[PDB]
Write a protein that binds this ligand. Sequence first.
Ligand code: NF3
Ligand code: NF3
Length: 297
Amino acid sequence: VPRGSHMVGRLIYTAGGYFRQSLSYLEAYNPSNGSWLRLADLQVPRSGLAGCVVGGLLYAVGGRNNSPDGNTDSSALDCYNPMTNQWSPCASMSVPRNRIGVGVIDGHIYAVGGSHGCIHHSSVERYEPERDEWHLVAPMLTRRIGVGVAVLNRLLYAVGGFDGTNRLNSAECYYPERNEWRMITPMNTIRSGAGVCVLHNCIYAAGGYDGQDQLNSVERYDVETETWTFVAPMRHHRSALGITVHQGKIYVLGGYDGHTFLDSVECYDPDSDTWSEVTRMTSGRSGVGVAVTMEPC
Ligand SMILES: CCOC(=O)/C=C/C(=O)O
Ligand SMILES: CCOC(=O)/C=C\C(=O)O
């Protein structure tokens, strides 16, 4: 469960992010010993990207390079191999997607929503690593940027976000065999840029922005009861946070609290319904991509 491949543990990788400008950092945190490693920079700076892992490879998807010399939304898919410590371009998406949400089903990467200039996407596309090919699938019922995405029981959920006019509490679910999206129970809070993940049988939505404050509240959707319930709030309000699951606990990384770009990383224990601080990143940032895979070489 803890060991992967050769004889190694798994790390929490954070890629990219934003502080003053879009960042190229790739760093990996080890919950077993508290250590941080700096790894190979992304080829192109990006905030607002998502991260995921397939076959042990780390993928960086979408985003936007906010640089003083120009701002460029990204359709880019790039893959990091922990065994070589090298980034490799993959095929690009049909469209640039900043503030994207990503989920993995059946070894396939789903890219959801996001923005391209003043365009807010409802479009969705699926990537097949064995063929290095993107194909559009059915669009969402809602245009969503800053959308959180999670996978539960081989179904993909798109949660919260912003359609261009209002921040959203709505959420919806993709059924792959019917290529069909259906709305589900909305959250009890409007959230854009929330951290969205799955733990046991629930989809969590932590933090985000409700249109006037960054949030510390956290809720989770029990798919069996189709209801949202608040759990314990985080210790920091945060928006544009990184999130992932590691050994049964939820990790939230950085974000913006309305005053500071956070370096705080918090870990949620579901058994005790408590959050603790477990480390800080090397520097404060928002809009990172986060995933978990094997230790690098
Ligand atoms: C069917 C392909 O699935 C994978 O290769 C998954 C890898 C992973 O979750 O690391
Ligand atoms: C008021 C401009 O919009 C924001 O500033 C939105 C979110 C955030 O900081 O987290």
